[PDB]
Design a protein around this ligand. Sequence first.
Ligand SMILES: *[C@@H]1O[C@H](CO)[C@@H](O[C@@H]2O[C@H](CO)[C@@H](O[C@@H]3O[C@H](CO[C@H]4O[C@H](CO[C@H]5O[C@H](CO)[C@@H](O)[C@H](O)[C@@H]5O[C@H]5O[C@H](CO)[C@@H](O)[C@H](O)[C@@H]5O)[C@@H](O)[C@H](O[C@H]5O[C@H](CO)[C@@H](O)[C@H](O)[C@@H]5O)[C@@H]4O)[C@@H](O)[C@H](O[C@H]4O[C@H](CO)[C@@H](O)[C@H](O)[C@@H]4O[C@H]4O[C@H](CO)[C@@H](O)[C@H](O)[C@@H]4O[C@H]4O[C@H](CO)[C@@H](O)[C@H](O)[C@@H]4O)[C@@H]3O)[C@H](O)[C@H]2NC(C)=O)[C@H](O)[C@H]1NC(C)=O
Ligand SMILES: *[C@@H]1O[C@H](CO)[C@@H](O[C@@H]2O[C@H](CO)[C@@H](O[C@@H]3O[C@H](CO[C@H]4O[C@H](CO[C@H]5O[C@H](CO)[C@@H](O)[C@H](O)[C@@H]5O[C@H]5O[C@H](CO)[C@@H](O)[C@H](O)[C@@H]5O)[C@@H](O)[C@H](O[C@H]5O[C@H](CO)[C@@H](O)[C@H](O)[C@@H]5O)[C@@H]4O)[C@@H](O)[C@H](O[C@H]4O[C@H](CO)[C@@H](O)[C@H](O)[C@@H]4O[C@H]4O[C@H](CO)[C@@H](O)[C@H](O)[C@@H]4O[C@H]4O[C@H](CO)[C@@H](O)[C@H](O)[C@@H]4O)[C@@H]3O)[C@H](O)[C@H]2NC(C)=O)[C@H](O)[C@H]1NC(C)=O
Ligand SMILES: *[C@@H]1O[C@H](CO)[C@@H](O[C@@H]2O[C@H](CO)[C@@H](O[C@@H]3O[C@H](CO[C@H]4O[C@H](CO)[C@@H](O)[C@H](O[C@H]5O[C@H](CO)[C@@H](O)[C@H](O)[C@@H]5O)[C@@H]4O)[C@@H](O)[C@H](O[C@H]4O[C@H](CO)[C@@H](O)[C@H](O)[C@@H]4O)[C@@H]3O)[C@H](O)[C@H]2NC(C)=O)[C@H](O)[C@H]1NC(C)=O
Ligand SMILES: *[C@@H]1O[C@H](CO)[C@@H](O[C@@H]2O[C@H](CO)[C@@H](O[C@@H]3O[C@H](CO[C@H]4O[C@H](CO)[C@@H](O)[C@H](O[C@H]5O[C@H](CO)[C@@H](O)[C@H](O)[C@@H]5O)[C@@H]4O)[C@@H](O)[C@H](O[C@H]4O[C@H](CO)[C@@H](O)[C@H](O)[C@@H]4O)[C@@H]3O)[C@H](O)[C@H]2NC(C)=O)[C@H](O)[C@H]1NC(C)=O
Ligand SMILES: OC[C@H]1O[C@H](OC[C@H]2O[C@H](O[C@]3(CO)O[C@H](CO)[C@@H](O)[C@@H]3O)[C@H](O)[C@@H](O)[C@@H]2O)[C@H](O)[C@@H](O)[C@H]1O
Ligand SMILES: OC[C@H]1O[C@H](OC[C@H]2O[C@H](O[C@]3(CO)O[C@H](CO)[C@@H](O)[C@@H]3O)[C@H](O)[C@@H](O)[C@@H]2O)[C@H](O)[C@@H](O)[C@H]1O
Ligand SMILES: *[C@@H]1O[C@H](CO)[C@@H](O)[C@H](O)[C@H]1NC(C)=O
Ligand SMILES: *[C@@H]1O[C@H](CO)[C@@H](O)[C@H](O)[C@H]1NC(C)=O
Ligand SMILES: *[C@@H]1O[C@H](CO)[C@@H](O)[C@H](O)[C@H]1NC(C)=O
Ligand SMILES: *[C@@H]1O[C@H](CO)[C@@H](O)[C@H](O)[C@H]1NC(C)=O
Ligand SMILES: *[C@@H]1O[C@H](CO)[C@@H](O)[C@H](O)[C@H]1NC(C)=O
Ligand SMILES: *[C@@H]1O[C@H](CO)[C@@H](O)[C@H](O)[C@H]1NC(C)=O
Ligand SMILES: *[C@@H]1O[C@H](CO)[C@@H](O)[C@H](O)[C@H]1NC(C)=O
Ligand SMILES: *[C@@H]1O[C@H](CO)[C@@H](O)[C@H](O)[C@H]1NC(C)=O
Ligand SMILES: *[C@@H]1O[C@H](CO)[C@@H](O)[C@H](O)[C@H]1NC(C)=O
Ligand SMILES: *[C@@H]1O[C@H](CO)[C@@H](O)[C@H](O)[C@H]1NC(C)=O
Ligand SMILES: *[C@@H]1O[C@H](CO)[C@@H](O)[C@H](O)[C@H]1NC(C)=O
Ligand SMILES: *[C@@H]1O[C@H](CO)[C@@H](O)[C@H](O)[C@H]1NC(C)=O
Ligand SMILES: *[C@@H]1O[C@H](CO)[C@@H](O)[C@H](O)[C@H]1NC(C)=O
Ligand SMILES: *[C@@H]1O[C@H](CO)[C@@H](O)[C@H](O)[C@H]1NC(C)=O
Lengths: 624, 624
Amino acid sequence: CSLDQTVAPGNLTLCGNATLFTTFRPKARFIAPEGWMNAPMGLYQRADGSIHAGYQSHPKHIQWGNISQGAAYSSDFTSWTDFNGSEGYKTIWPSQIYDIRGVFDGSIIKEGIDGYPTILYTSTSFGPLGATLNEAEGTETQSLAYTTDDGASWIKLGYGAGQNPVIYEWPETNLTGFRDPYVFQSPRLEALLANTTSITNATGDHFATISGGVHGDGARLFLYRQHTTGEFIKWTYLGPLVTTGYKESYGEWSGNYGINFETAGVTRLNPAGAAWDNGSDTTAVDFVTFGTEQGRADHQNHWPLWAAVDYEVRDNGSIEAVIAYSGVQDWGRSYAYASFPVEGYRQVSVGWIYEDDDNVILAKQFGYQGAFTLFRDLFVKVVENVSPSTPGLFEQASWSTKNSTDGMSVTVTTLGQRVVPETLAAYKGNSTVSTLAPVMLNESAAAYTPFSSQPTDRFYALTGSFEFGLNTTAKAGFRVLASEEEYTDIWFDPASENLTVVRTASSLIKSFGNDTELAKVKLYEIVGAESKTLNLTVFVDGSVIEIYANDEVALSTRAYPWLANSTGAGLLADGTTAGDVVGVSGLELWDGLVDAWPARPANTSQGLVWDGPTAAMYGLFAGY
Amino acid sequence: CSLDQTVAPGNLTLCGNATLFTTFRPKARFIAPEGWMNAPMGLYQRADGSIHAGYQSHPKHIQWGNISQGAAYSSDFTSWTDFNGSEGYKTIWPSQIYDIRGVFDGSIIKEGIDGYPTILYTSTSFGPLGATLNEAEGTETQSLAYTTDDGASWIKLGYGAGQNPVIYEWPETNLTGFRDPYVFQSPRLEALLANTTSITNATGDHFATISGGVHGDGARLFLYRQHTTGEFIKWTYLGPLVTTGYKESYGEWSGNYGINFETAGVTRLNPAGAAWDNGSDTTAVDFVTFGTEQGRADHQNHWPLWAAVDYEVRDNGSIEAVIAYSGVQDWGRSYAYASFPVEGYRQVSVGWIYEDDDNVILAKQFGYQGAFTLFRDLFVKVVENVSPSTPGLFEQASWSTKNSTDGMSVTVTTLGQRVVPETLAAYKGNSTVSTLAPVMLNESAAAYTPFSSQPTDRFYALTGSFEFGLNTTAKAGFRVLASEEEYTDIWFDPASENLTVVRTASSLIKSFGNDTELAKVKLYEIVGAESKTLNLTVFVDGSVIEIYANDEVALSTRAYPWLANSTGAGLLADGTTAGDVVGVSGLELWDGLVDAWPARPANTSQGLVWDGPTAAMYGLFAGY
Ligand SMILES: *[C@@H]1O[C@H](CO)[C@@H](O[C@@H]2O[C@H](CO)[C@@H](O[C@@H]3O[C@H](CO[C@H]4O[C@H](CO[C@H]5O[C@H](CO)[C@@H](O)[C@H](O)[C@@H]5O[C@H]5O[C@H](CO)[C@@H](O)[C@H](O)[C@@H]5O)[C@@H](O)[C@H](O[C@H]5O[C@H](CO)[C@@H](O)[C@H](O)[C@@H]5O)[C@@H]4O)[C@@H](O)[C@H](O[C@H]4O[C@H](CO)[C@@H](O)[C@H](O)[C@@H]4O[C@H]4O[C@H](CO)[C@@H](O)[C@H](O)[C@@H]4O[C@H]4O[C@H](CO)[C@@H](O)[C@H](O)[C@@H]4O)[C@@H]3O)[C@H](O)[C@H]2NC(C)=O)[C@H](O)[C@H]1NC(C)=O
Ligand SMILES: *[C@@H]1O[C@H](CO)[C@@H](O[C@@H]2O[C@H](CO)[C@@H](O[C@@H]3O[C@H](CO[C@H]4O[C@H](CO[C@H]5O[C@H](CO)[C@@H](O)[C@H](O)[C@@H]5O[C@H]5O[C@H](CO)[C@@H](O)[C@H](O)[C@@H]5O)[C@@H](O)[C@H](O[C@H]5O[C@H](CO)[C@@H](O)[C@H](O)[C@@H]5O)[C@@H]4O)[C@@H](O)[C@H](O[C@H]4O[C@H](CO)[C@@H](O)[C@H](O)[C@@H]4O[C@H]4O[C@H](CO)[C@@H](O)[C@H](O)[C@@H]4O[C@H]4O[C@H](CO)[C@@H](O)[C@H](O)[C@@H]4O)[C@@H]3O)[C@H](O)[C@H]2NC(C)=O)[C@H](O)[C@H]1NC(C)=O
Ligand SMILES: *[C@@H]1O[C@H](CO)[C@@H](O[C@@H]2O[C@H](CO)[C@@H](O[C@@H]3O[C@H](CO[C@H]4O[C@H](CO)[C@@H](O)[C@H](O[C@H]5O[C@H](CO)[C@@H](O)[C@H](O)[C@@H]5O)[C@@H]4O)[C@@H](O)[C@H](O[C@H]4O[C@H](CO)[C@@H](O)[C@H](O)[C@@H]4O)[C@@H]3O)[C@H](O)[C@H]2NC(C)=O)[C@H](O)[C@H]1NC(C)=O
Ligand SMILES: *[C@@H]1O[C@H](CO)[C@@H](O[C@@H]2O[C@H](CO)[C@@H](O[C@@H]3O[C@H](CO[C@H]4O[C@H](CO)[C@@H](O)[C@H](O[C@H]5O[C@H](CO)[C@@H](O)[C@H](O)[C@@H]5O)[C@@H]4O)[C@@H](O)[C@H](O[C@H]4O[C@H](CO)[C@@H](O)[C@H](O)[C@@H]4O)[C@@H]3O)[C@H](O)[C@H]2NC(C)=O)[C@H](O)[C@H]1NC(C)=O
Ligand SMILES: OC[C@H]1O[C@H](OC[C@H]2O[C@H](O[C@]3(CO)O[C@H](CO)[C@@H](O)[C@@H]3O)[C@H](O)[C@@H](O)[C@@H]2O)[C@H](O)[C@@H](O)[C@H]1O
Ligand SMILES: OC[C@H]1O[C@H](OC[C@H]2O[C@H](O[C@]3(CO)O[C@H](CO)[C@@H](O)[C@@H]3O)[C@H](O)[C@@H](O)[C@@H]2O)[C@H](O)[C@@H](O)[C@H]1O
Ligand SMILES: *[C@@H]1O[C@H](CO)[C@@H](O)[C@H](O)[C@H]1NC(C)=O
Ligand SMILES: *[C@@H]1O[C@H](CO)[C@@H](O)[C@H](O)[C@H]1NC(C)=O
Ligand SMILES: *[C@@H]1O[C@H](CO)[C@@H](O)[C@H](O)[C@H]1NC(C)=O
Ligand SMILES: *[C@@H]1O[C@H](CO)[C@@H](O)[C@H](O)[C@H]1NC(C)=O
Ligand SMILES: *[C@@H]1O[C@H](CO)[C@@H](O)[C@H](O)[C@H]1NC(C)=O
Ligand SMILES: *[C@@H]1O[C@H](CO)[C@@H](O)[C@H](O)[C@H]1NC(C)=O
Ligand SMILES: *[C@@H]1O[C@H](CO)[C@@H](O)[C@H](O)[C@H]1NC(C)=O
Ligand SMILES: *[C@@H]1O[C@H](CO)[C@@H](O)[C@H](O)[C@H]1NC(C)=O
Ligand SMILES: *[C@@H]1O[C@H](CO)[C@@H](O)[C@H](O)[C@H]1NC(C)=O
Ligand SMILES: *[C@@H]1O[C@H](CO)[C@@H](O)[C@H](O)[C@H]1NC(C)=O
Ligand SMILES: *[C@@H]1O[C@H](CO)[C@@H](O)[C@H](O)[C@H]1NC(C)=O
Ligand SMILES: *[C@@H]1O[C@H](CO)[C@@H](O)[C@H](O)[C@H]1NC(C)=O
Ligand SMILES: *[C@@H]1O[C@H](CO)[C@@H](O)[C@H](O)[C@H]1NC(C)=O
Ligand SMILES: *[C@@H]1O[C@H](CO)[C@@H](O)[C@H](O)[C@H]1NC(C)=O
């Protein structure tokens, strides 16, 4: 095994465990110290204002198993510190018959058992588990634990009658899944249900959704309500909140609803951020965010979606969330988005970016798998004075339209997402910032034009505003992680409305994924404008490429170029002419970003281990 | 619920949990503080000379589940003290994927991991488990833990390759069971295998048997040898040590070998006790003790057996233990005998006495189930100068015969069992002892003759020597726990060779078992004697009746009389006449015995709990 990145890569499968630990590794984002990670979990803002983030974790392995909560904290979403206890950076792990198969995703009751922060999580035990298997009741249950030391440790309730697990009965038969409890307070839902509380007797101030579905009949998000305020054992099933059809799709802008939901959450937003009104704020919109399974041919059969919903009260004292419009939270290799409230009327969302090594060819050589996305403020994006001639505007696919009284303009409403400002400020302030001159892309434009200042490593951010003619057929964008032989091309093609990431040349290492990523982006044309603009922000962080368009569209993906000099970046142009010109302005390079884990050394591998021959006997975990 | 024991019992099923805690409870023997117990485990003499005893334990329940090691210690086998740690009196419990279904029976390596006492135990996980089910590999494995604090706590080896579990591969397919590892040193087996160690490479000084069998083809005791001295991970399967047939019986004196072995151990004894020679002691005999399943119509389908064996070395470097003769360790409601070495060349054996409430009618009202037997010294019983006219002597069923050179006398050899002298001394010394006058049972003998001194409670011992004519048809014995309306009759009938416990009147409470217990007892007639003698010792301890005959035959059973005055005792006589007389001598009553748990209050119940609806979902434990 040669690690010479000035020549072509050899057979890297001969390399030892964790020999490629630093080669492709993100430095500026949330990631476990080593080993396997997946979904964020247990997210909450602590009493001191800091952020506690948990994650599905399997240390010293590069496949899922014995799944536990790893945890860390930060005062600014950006610079983090690991917890360190008797189980290293783990704070919850399988330990009881009810959760021995895995401590799955869970969410936080901030004032829970004895007033302490409390996690409601999916406790798993033995048996077939999965949307495509024949799961039985008991395999997935929901259990409580609380912390008396701000997340350094958690104490589970005892096993038994009237204790853990607290939710175990399936609300309907033949479930495809029954997990990922999302606990939330909702003045909105309380106001809606207030006239029906005699029917159910459920009067608590916390609601919980559980994600699942029904075999052959589509996904379900099940709604429970805490039976009595201040008491956390009894949760009353109200009814299904969201019901979708077997592999139903709302269309090209909305992914596919699959067969089973996962990691679903419920929030309420207005243009500024989180909305905690009872329905009285006419600018507020109710949203559900959710993953779906088996409605996608690639990306691990997983769509991370969202929907705006209008709540209706059923006669039995339950809530139907009727989907008004439906979109995609991220179009790339990410999933398992969790959102949580943050002081100052914010709802912040974060997901998991998986690797692009689905055949597990170099995972051992990495010595880790997975990272988080960046943390994102959610809000209602409102675009005023939209031209009615915007192509496809009245499809109202992942947005709503409201006509002006005179019919000459439209107000567009959709889900907004933007990187939390703490991270943008820290990134910029710690980087070498190059403010670049604007560039007209015309007949003289090369296919690729390097920026006048270049990155120094694989940790940088780009921004640019691309102004297109209303009838353009030109394409433009950014090339990143680029040398002569390796590069990743991010294109927008306004004629097709497609944002693509072409990865056919991303790496000389052929075992990594190279499929083209694709997002739809609607450029809402403004009344009186003779052009349409794409604001593109790109974060390059080891192997992560995370793209944001117009504080709306997100696409996370992976690139693993071998060569040390595959770090360059610049502008892409295709079919730009004297007549079809793309004006690029607001161009800026931030080189370096932030060291997100300042206390960690460069190599935090502790080696990898094998569970031995019993892993196959038990059949629960791959074993490595 | 009335607890008036001066009148007939009401409907005791209306009584609350643990309301009958003290009513029938042993006071003079090893028993858990409360709840469910079964098999002894983890028995060893500690460095300070005290005895550590573990037991299969499920606190706050009255059926088996979450099975754990409860533990206590004693300097004299007789007066005990509970361990008290973070899990009460438990010291090992289910905690890992490999043992989450139960910490089953295990045995002690005295100089194990890092020189510390080390337990090798059956770690169980999910799946069908049982001799009559379709068990699969992995469900029962064998794991290690060690103690740095003389049994107050145990540290398990880690889960994984080269660590726990240490034995997981089934030595043959389609096993009925794979559990109860018995670790032992054996100069005998080492000497026998010394010429074959090149074949197997196994040269360690510890052996281990694992108890099981093969579906449709009888029981098996599998022999392993520690691969390398001072190393405890690698154990090499040599071959089957004991192989018996599907429900094979050696006859009337030997129970039935069933379909599966449990709790089997290997020892070597001579007339004084334990023998640690290499084969050079011609007075020493190799023994296996073992439980069998499904070869019995009652007594929970369980026979606690033993066999004298002659070892043969196989060509592949393994040992066949060929059964020479075969007997019964206890004929009553006991099982799961474990033996362990004790200083002064002793091997001490102890088992578990189950209740006689198999339909679980009053178990909750008890608030506990189970006790130990008394601790028993094992030795080779040798009877010299036996008359060749002893009926049935040359059947050599559970004994051996060696003729004198002249053929006029026989030496009989069998397994001897006697209560450890520490217990007999402590019992007698703490009791009110009444030495009773000898009694001739003749034509004037009543059916029942109370002793001249009477017990004061349900805690006493009796002894007597019953001298019978060689052609007697009379029966004699002891009645115990007796009032006019309730009593338990212990009869010996030399003509049939049957020792019986008749329990048709043991209790007014009709839900307890009332079947007649039966043991065979061979009165070896001595050359020149005109009579034959039965030495009977009986311990009455709450509901336990534990009978010893001639330091050979043991029979443990249960009686639960309701009335407070059902405590009396005396002599039984049937068919005694002027010509057929039974001479009873050496009669002694010990009233009171010892308070075996001096630190415990009278009621150590902590209440009972229910596991809730998930118990049935998981299907592993009854849940109460
Ligand atoms: C199979 O068997 C298994 C083993 O038995 C069994 O698992 C065990 O289950 C039991 C029962 O559920 C669990 O017991 C609970 O423990 C909770 C605390 O748990 C934390 O702490 C313990 C013990 O802590 C120590 O010991 C360890 C080990 O040495 C040390 O590491 C610690 O430093 C600490 O040591 C100190 O203390 C020791 C003595 O205990 C000393 O020896 C030592 O020197 C030190 O000084 C840990 O072991 C736990 O770890 C395990 O669990 C965590 C997850 O939780 C894992 O991550 C980890 O790996 C371990 O597996 C853990 O850290 C107790 O809080 C709980 O006690 C209460 O609940 C019951 C009701 O169920 C009440 O009876 C009791 O009164 C307590 O409730 C009161 O208090 C709470 C708040 O504290 C209130 O909310 C509540 O309302 C109530 O209040 C009442 O009283 C108040 C009085 O002030 C009053 O104010 C109120 O008004 C009110 O009236 C319970 O004891 C046990 O932890 C499990 N153990 C393990 C190893 O799993 C398993 O379930 C079985 N399975 C099946 C299928 O049956
Ligand atoms: C799913 O995830 C699960 C959770 O991660 C996982 O279970 C965990 O597995 C790991 C890995 O196997 C276990 O880790 C081992 O722990 C052993 C010790 O275990 C005992 O102690 C721990 C920790 O003790 C403390 O913390 C608790 C909780 O707060 C307190 O109660 C205690 O008081 C004590 O607290 C003090 O210390 C804390 C810091 O640790 C402080 O925070 C605190 O303030 C106090 O000061 C307990 O948690 C354990 O309890 C659990 O397990 C018991 C059964 O064992 C249960 O009954 C109980 O309910 C709990 O479940 C337990 O009591 C370590 O000994 C072991 O360390 C060694 O092994 C590895 C190799 O595997 C080596 O890397 C390492 O060096 C150690 O080996 C050396 O040392 C030994 C002798 O000590 C030698 O034999 C050996 O050769 C080697 O020697 C070498 O170094 C020497 C240096 O001196 C040198 O001399 C030699 O020459 C040689 O070179 C290991 O860390 C962990 O316990 C499990 N935890 C739990 C909760 O289960 C599970 O497996 C996963 N499942 C799957 C399917 O993957
Ligand atoms: C005495 O000790 C027992 C432990 O043995 C303590 O707990 C009780 O255990 C028994 C089992 O021995 C349980 O009986 C079973 O009950 C279920 C149905 O339970 C439901 O109905 C109950 C009656 O109103 C109710 O109390 C239960 O509520 C508890 O449990 C729920 C979880 O479901 C929890 O949320 C609550 O907070 C309570 O803790 C519950 O709603 C029944 O299905 C079982 O039936 C089987 O067995 C019977 C008898 O063999 C048979 O007739 C059936 O056909 C079936 O096979 C079984 O009856 C009892 O529920 C437990 N009670 C509890 C936990 O409160 C008991 O508390 C101790 N008493 C005291 C005073 O300490
Ligand atoms: C690097 O990290 C790995 C963890 O990922 C460390 O452990 C090794 O993990 C791999 C899995 O990633 C294991 O590979 C499997 O091995 C088994 C067969 O194992 C046997 O043969 C080995 C080779 O001689 C031997 O080392 C093993 O000994 C260990 O385990 C036994 C318990 O069985 C234990 O008693 C010993 O003490 C050792 O700990 C063992 O005898 C094989 O069956 C598996 O095959 C599957 O997968 C492959 C590849 O996909 C495929 O070809 C097959 O068809 C099948 O699907 C698999 O290869 C490896 O055994 C682990 N090695 C160990 C534990 O030593 C590894 O140690 C780390 N290296 C370093 C230097 O730290
Ligand atoms: O069939 C068993 C299954 O086990 C493992 O997968 C478990 C579960 O993981 C994922 O679910 C989410 C979201 O991705 O991740 C956590 C668990 O870490 C859940 O709380 C959450 O819903 C998958 O999306 C599920 O499909 C999957 O069942 C293992 O990884 C699988 O390979 C498989 O063996
Ligand atoms: O089928 C599962 C089975 O689980 C429980 O029984 C387990 C096991 O217990 C007994 O085995 C012994 C000896 O009696 O006891 C310990 C376990 O505590 C073992 O180490 C030891 O061999 C029985 O003899 C076995 O037949 C039995 O499989 C439960 O009690 C059963 O009812 C049943 O549900
Ligand atoms: C980048 O590195 C490769 C291999 O060392 C080399 O061929 C190339 O010329 C280098 N410089 C570039 C692309 O600017
Ligand atoms: C790469 O090495 C592996 C062994 O790790 C080998 O099986 C494979 O054929 C090699 N690939 C080549 C030489 O292209
Ligand atoms: C309430 O009604 C809805 C609509 O039919 C149903 O799906 C849900 O299960 C009902 N809630 C119950 C039975 O608690
Ligand atoms: C919205 O405006 C467009 C263009 O003016 C028009 O076609 C459509 O009918 C309007 N919708 C409503 C509800 O007035
Ligand atoms: C650099 O990053 C840290 C960590 O997030 C942040 O607190 C600090 O303000 C940044 N430095 C600047 C903006 O100069
Ligand atoms: C030019 O773009 C406008 C929308 O901006 C569209 O309505 C019109 O049809 C386009 N012209 C073509 C296709 O010739
Ligand atoms: C744009 O994307 C859609 C997928 O939504 C695809 O069907 C279409 O072919 C794409 N067109 C171009 C020109 O990229
Ligand atoms: C024993 O008690 C019962 C019920 O109180 C009574 O009938 C009997 O006469 C008492 N005395 C005996 C049997 O000596
Ligand atoms: C005893 O009480 C139980 C209830 O615990 C009842 O079902 C049974 O019929 C009663 N037996 C009688 C009255 O003989
Ligand atoms: C040794 O031979 C015996 C007798 O055939 C056999 O039962 C046992 O499995 C053999 N040992 C092995 C294969 O290790
Ligand atoms: C043992 O003694 C009996 C009676 O003397 C006799 O019948 C039998 O043949 C003897 N056995 C041997 C081996 O001599
Ligand atoms: C009473 O019993 C204790 C506990 O076993 C024992 O140590 C003591 O010697 C006994 N008293 C005697 C023999 O007087
Ligand atoms: C009397 O007993 C002896 C053995 O002690 C026996 O050999 C003999 O047959 C018996 N007498 C009978 C049955 O008449
Ligand atoms: C003695 O016990 C045996 C069982 O071994 C039995 O078959 C026989 O009938 C019994 N005889 C008498 C008289 O009790």
